[PDB]
Amino acid sequence: MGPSLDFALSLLRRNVRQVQTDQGHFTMLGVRDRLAVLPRHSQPGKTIWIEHKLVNILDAVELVDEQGVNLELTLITLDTNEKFRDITKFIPENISTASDATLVINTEHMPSMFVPVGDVVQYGFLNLSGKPTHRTMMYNFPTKAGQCGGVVTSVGKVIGIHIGGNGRQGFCAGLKRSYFA
Numbered sequence: 001m002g003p004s005l006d007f008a009l010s011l012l013r014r015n016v017r018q019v020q021t022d023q024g025h026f027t028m029l030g031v032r033d034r035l036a037v038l039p040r041h042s043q044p045g046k047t048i049w050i051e052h053k054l055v056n057i058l059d060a061v062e063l064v065d066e067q068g069v070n071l072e073l074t075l076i077t078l079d080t081n082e083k084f085r086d087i088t089k090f091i092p093e094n095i096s097t098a099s100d101a102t103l104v105i106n107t108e109h110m111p112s113m114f115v116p117v118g119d120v121v122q123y124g125f126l127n128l129s130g131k132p133t134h135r136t137m138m139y140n141f142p143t144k145a146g147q148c149g150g151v152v153t154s155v156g157k158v159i160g161i162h163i164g165g166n167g168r169q170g171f172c173a174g175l176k177r178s179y180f181a
C-alpha cells in the first residue's frame with residue numbers, strides 16, 4: 001500500500017472517532033493526550049457518545065478570534081484512559097491551503113469514508129445558519145449533512161475540520177497548531 005492511503009487509514013484508526021451529541025452524528029478528531037476537537041454546532045454537553053461508550057467531557061472551549069468572532073471549533077478534554085496519538089506536528093503553524101485534499105469522515109452512518117474534495121483554497125468569512133465564522137476554507141465539492149467534523153487532509157498534513165456547505169461548495173474551519181498547544 002501507498003503513502004497517502006497509509007496516512008489517512010492510520011489517522012482513522014488512531015485519531016478519528018465516531019461520535020453522537022444531542023445534535024446527532026459527528027466525526028471527532030483526537031489531537032493529543034485527552035484533547036479532541038469538534039465543530040462548535042455539535043454542542044457537546046457533559047457527556048458524549050464515542051463509538052461504543054459514553055464519555056465524560058471535563059472541559060469545553062469554543063474558539064473565538066481576537067475580534068470576538070466565532071471560529072466553529074470546540075476543544076474538548078475527555079475523561080478517558082486513552083491518550084490520543086499526538087498529531088500536532090501534522091497541523092500547520094498557520095492555516096494552510098492545499099491541493100488534491102481529502103476529507104476523512106467517520107460516523108456510525110458514514111464510517112471510514114473518503115471524499116476527494118480536491119484543491120482547498122482560502123475562503124475567509126462564511127455564513128452558516130445565520131452564524132458568521134472566521135478563518136474558514138473552501139473546496140468545490142458538494143458536501144452533505146452528516147459530514148461535519150470530517151477531517152480535511154493532504155500530503156500527511158491535517159488542515160481543517162468540515163463545518164458547513166451549500167450544495168455545491170463545502171467549507172471547513174482551518175486548523176493551526178496553536179489551538180492545541
Ligand SMILES: */C(=C/C(=O)OCC)[C@H](C[C@@H]1CCNC1=O)NC(=O)[C@H](Cc1ccccc1)NC(C)=O
Binds near residue numbers: 131142143167
Ligand atoms: C454538517 C452538520 C450536520 O449534518 O447537521 C445537520 C443539520 C453540515 C454539513 C454541510 C451543510 C449542508 N451540507 C454540508 O455539506 N453543516 C451544517 O449544517 C452547518 C451547521 C452550522 C451551524 C452554525 C454555524 C456553523 C455551521 N450549517 C450549514 C448552513 O452548513
